Amino acid sequence: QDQEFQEGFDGGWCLSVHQPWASLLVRGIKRVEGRSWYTPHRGRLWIAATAKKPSPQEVSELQATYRLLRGKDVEFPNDYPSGCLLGCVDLIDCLSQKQFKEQFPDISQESDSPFVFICKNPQEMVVKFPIKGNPKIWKLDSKIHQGAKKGLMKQNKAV
């Protein structure tokens, strides 16, 4: 077998996430994503922002929460664009609450969900591609994926 080997390939898979959480994921400010379902997916996972347009107050209050969770001096993006492919993370593991609490006791407070997607290596594209989303973890159009792999990434500052 070769589990680590197969997961190292980028299969062009995507998760749709509402703003403001979507941009927080590709910036590394949000480092776990909770869901009520279990995924066997491991490795590269592209992040698309849905069509939702959060209000300025919603963004402001979520920023205040992530400052409390991550540190008072954490910096945030000026824009949380809707309806586009933002970048990617690497999905390291999909943990139950029990596993998340014992493996990550200092940060388990960051997700209360039945399953917790452990995200590493956040990358944000400079050019973001308009895209329609789908449920769960879904397959990017091949041409979109090809463009995303070629696309210039920002060197974001560490959180």
UniProtKB/Swiss-Prot annotation:
Q: Which UniProt keywords apply?
A: Acetylation, Congenital muscular dystrophy, Cytoplasm, Cytoskeleton, Isopeptide bond, Metal-binding, Neurodegeneration, Nucleus, Phosphoprotein, Transcription, Transcription regulation, Ubl conjugation, Zinc, Zinc-finger
Give GO terms for biological process.
Answer: estrogen receptor signaling pathway; positive regulation of DNA-templated transcription; regulation of DNA-templated transcription; regulation of myoblast differentiation; rescue of stalled ribosome; ribosome disassembly; ribosome-associated ubiquitin-dependent protein catabolic process
Instruction: Give all residue intervals belonging to the ASCH domain.
Output: 15-109
Q: From the Swiss-Prot or TrEMBL record, state where the protein is found.
A: Nucleus; Cytoplasm, Cytosol; Cytoplasm, Cytoskeleton, Microtubule organizing center, Centrosome
Record-level Gene Ontology MF annotations:
histone acetyltransferase binding; nuclear estrogen receptor binding; nuclear receptor binding; protease binding; protein kinase binding; transcription coactivator activity; ubiquitin-like protein ligase binding; zinc ion binding
Q: Which domain of life is it from?
A: Eukaryota
GO CC annotation, single: nucleus
Post-translational modification comment from the UniProt entry: Phosphorylated by NEK6.
Name the disease.
Answer: Spinal muscular atrophy with congenital bone fractures 1: An autosomal recessive neuromuscular disorder characterized by prenatal-onset spinal muscular atrophy, multiple congenital contractures consistent with arthrogryposis multiplex congenita, respiratory distress, and congenital bone fractures.
Assembly behavior:
Interacts with the thyroid hormone receptor/TR (via the ligand-binding domain); this interaction requires the presence of thyroid hormone. Interacts with the androgen receptor/AR; in an androgen, testosterone and dihydrotestosterone-dependent manner. Interacts with ESR1 (estrogen ligand-bound); competes with UFSP2. Interacts with UFSP2; competes with ligand-bound ESR1. Interacts with DDRGK1 and UFL1; the interaction with DDRGK1 is direct. Interacts with NCOA1. Interacts with EP300. Part of the ASC-1 complex, that contains TRIP4, ASCC1, ASCC2 and ASCC3.
General function of this protein: Transcription coactivator which associates with nuclear receptors, transcriptional coactivators including EP300, CREBBP and NCOA1, and basal transcription factors like TBP and TFIIA to facilitate nuclear receptors-mediated transcription. May thereby play an important role in establishing distinct coactivator complexes under different cellular conditions. Plays a role in thyroid hormone receptor and estrogen receptor transactivation. Also involved in androgen receptor transactivation. Plays a pivotal role in the transactivation of NF-kappa-B, SRF and AP1.
Know anything about its domains from the record? The C4-type zinc finger mediates a competitive interaction with UFSP2 and ligand-bound nuclear receptors. It also mediates interaction with the transcriptional coactivators and the basal transcription machinery.
Can you say what this protein is called?
A: Activating signal cointegrator 1
| Protein species of origin | Homo sapiens (Human)
What residues of the intact protein does this structure contain?
Answer: 423 to 581 of 581
